[PDB]
Design a protein around this ligand. Structure first.
Ligand SMILES: N=C(N)Nc1ccccc1
Lengths: 10, 247
């Protein structure tokens, strides 16, 4: 996961 | 969504709520999306890249609540799940973070406009509004960066488009924001997209019309000074979109 992801699963 | 206000589907009737069914039979929310035509919902590739199998996903339209049913909602299966072939995920950011879902009901129907369901227009290619233009974002994302639960009622807020000039400043995101992305934030930095809002719409008025200008992708923190939301610049993907959709 990218450090700035907004994806709930990260 | 940080700040902003609770709303209902009628104020954002293009909003698509996407869930993944679990081998248990548990079903949990994945991401938002936007209904761009009766059979087609657009979202972000990163929501699906881990589990890329259309069968596991359900799409709701007309849905105002996260974990309970809204009247007027309609449930859909994914007929095909189209990820972007140049998708990539970096240490900080996503690239080409866009996806298409073709929806069909078990009955075989596509979306039907209603009080609670309407399509949203795509912009013209490379046509985006001007920086400082106010736009709307919607979603079931966290109301605070530190929360562990998601809100049960849909939310929206208003943010302002930022120049690439300004978004590239090193105290913002520097080289990590490319021209295929769009920045938007509150001038006072009190409202934002957040975790769980990804795939959802950034909607602006572009020459009279409410248009889908962005797709929630990534940002550092939520409502953090100098660190705005980053969105997939939709105007730059029409060929991709039309290729896969004109079918
Ligand atoms: N919008 C932000 N400031 N941050 C953010 C956080 C999570 C997903 C997308 C964007």
């Amino acid at each position: 996961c990218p450090a700035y992801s907004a994806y709930l699963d990260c | 969504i940080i700040g902003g206000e609770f709303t209902t589907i009628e104020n954002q009737p293009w909003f698509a709520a996407i869930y993944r069914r679990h081998r248990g039979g548990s079903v949990t929310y994945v991401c938002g999306g936007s209904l761009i035509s009766p059979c087609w919902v657009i979202s972000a590739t990163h929501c699906f890249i881990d589990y890329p199998k259309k069968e596991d996903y359900i799409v709701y339209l007309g849905r105002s609540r996260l974990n309970s049913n809204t009247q007027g909602e309609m449930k859909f299966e994914v007929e095909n799940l189209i990820l972007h072939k140049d998708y990539s995920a970096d240490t900080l950011a996503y690239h080409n973070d866009i996806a298409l879902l073709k929806i069909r009901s078990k009955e075989g129907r596509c979306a039907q406009p209603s009080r609670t369901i309407q399509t949203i227009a795509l912009p013209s290619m490379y046509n985006d509004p001007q920086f400082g233009t106010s736009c709307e974002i919607t979603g079931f994302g966290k109301e605070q960066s530190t929360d562990y639960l998601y809100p049960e009622q849909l939310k929206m807020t208003v943010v302002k488009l930022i120049s690439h000039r300004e978004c590239q400043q090193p105290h913002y995101y520097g080289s990590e924001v490319t021209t295929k992305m769009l920045c938007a934030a509150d001038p006072q930095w009190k409202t934002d997209s957040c975790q769980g809002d990804s795939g959802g719409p950034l909607v602006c008025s572009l020459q009279g019309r409410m248009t889908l200008t962005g797709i929630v992708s990534w940002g550092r923190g939520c409502a953090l000074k100098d660190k705005p939301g980053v969105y997939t610049r939709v105007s730059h993907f029409l060929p991709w979109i039309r290729s896969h959709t004109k079918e």
